[PDB]
UniProtKB/TrEMBL annotation, chain A:
Residues represented out of the complete protein: 1 to 145 of 181
Coiled coil: none
Domain BFN: 2-134
Molecular function in Gene Ontology: nuclease activity
Record protein name field: BFN domain-containing protein
UniProtKB/TrEMBL annotation, chain B:
Superkingdom to which the source organism belongs: Bacteria
Descriptive protein name: BFN domain-containing protein
Domain BFN: 2-137
GO molecular function terms noted in the UniProt entry: nuclease activity
UniProt organism field: Thermotoga maritima (strain ATCC 43589 / DSM 3109 / JCM 10099 / NBRC 100826 / MSB8)
Whole-protein coverage range: 1 to 141 of 181
């Protein structure tokens, strides 16, 4: 199935210089990096900072729509890598298995997860094929 | 009490280096300029260009959410302006069905306009704003 992940860290990559996401894979010393666009980075940094703004940003709007339709984000699954691209599923639950799988970028799914506090899962297959494991010196190198 | 509107151009404000949406006003000679940030003007440019990517962008995400909950964008209103900040209303329609079954979600003008462009749905502006804050070409 799928193992639970959280957001370890959101860096700017020290060469290519775009945002990157390190998903920690709960229960393990493994992390999965996903390279996202610049705007999605700034949106995420704001969600991570749990940042109060006097105007609803694009994911606030989305969650309003969910709210308004008595439904709520449930969980968020990053499930495939096809040719340098990461496919995620945003699973809505309809407050009125009443679940809906909606296709999503990982960056979006991961933002909404942060804002709601709803869990993030990563496909087993991803973890095996595409995650990496850190020693002592490896992890320290990024703090 | 409010006028139809549309997106005339997405200009740069080459002083402040920042996008302005220039909304036309159906049946008049004046337009209303709304400043938005660059991330947002790029979102809007992509919509105006009206084209494909393989992956759903955030606003495509949101619409994709609407689809699934039997719902859709009905219209979009820019009602107010306190301190250089414009205040919109995404009105969504309950596609489970009437006039009272409409939803008034508070939204920035950036995301409102963007979601109307994407859907082909009518933008309006409050009589109020047009009176004080519109302008000539």
């Amino acid at each position: 199935h799928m193992r639970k992940a959280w957001v370890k860290t959101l860096a700017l990559d020290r060469v290519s210089n775009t945002p990157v996401v390190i998903l920690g894979i709960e229960g393990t010393n493994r992390v999965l990096p996903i390279w996202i666009g610049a705007a999605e980075g700034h949106a995420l940094a704001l969600a991570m900072e749990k940042m109060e703004f006097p105007r609803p940003l694009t994911h606030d709007l989305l969650l309003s729509v969910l709210e308004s339709l008595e439904a709520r984000v449930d969980k968020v699954i990053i499930h495939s890598l096809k040719d340098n691209t990461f496919y995620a599923t945003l699973v809505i639950r309809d407050l009125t298995a009443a679940l809906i799988d909606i296709d999503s970028r990982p960056s979006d799914a991961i933002i909404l997860a942060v804002k709601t506090g709803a869990p993030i899962f990563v496909s087993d297959n991803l973890v095996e094929k595409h995650s990496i494991e850190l020693e002592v010196n490896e992890r320290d190198l990024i703090n």
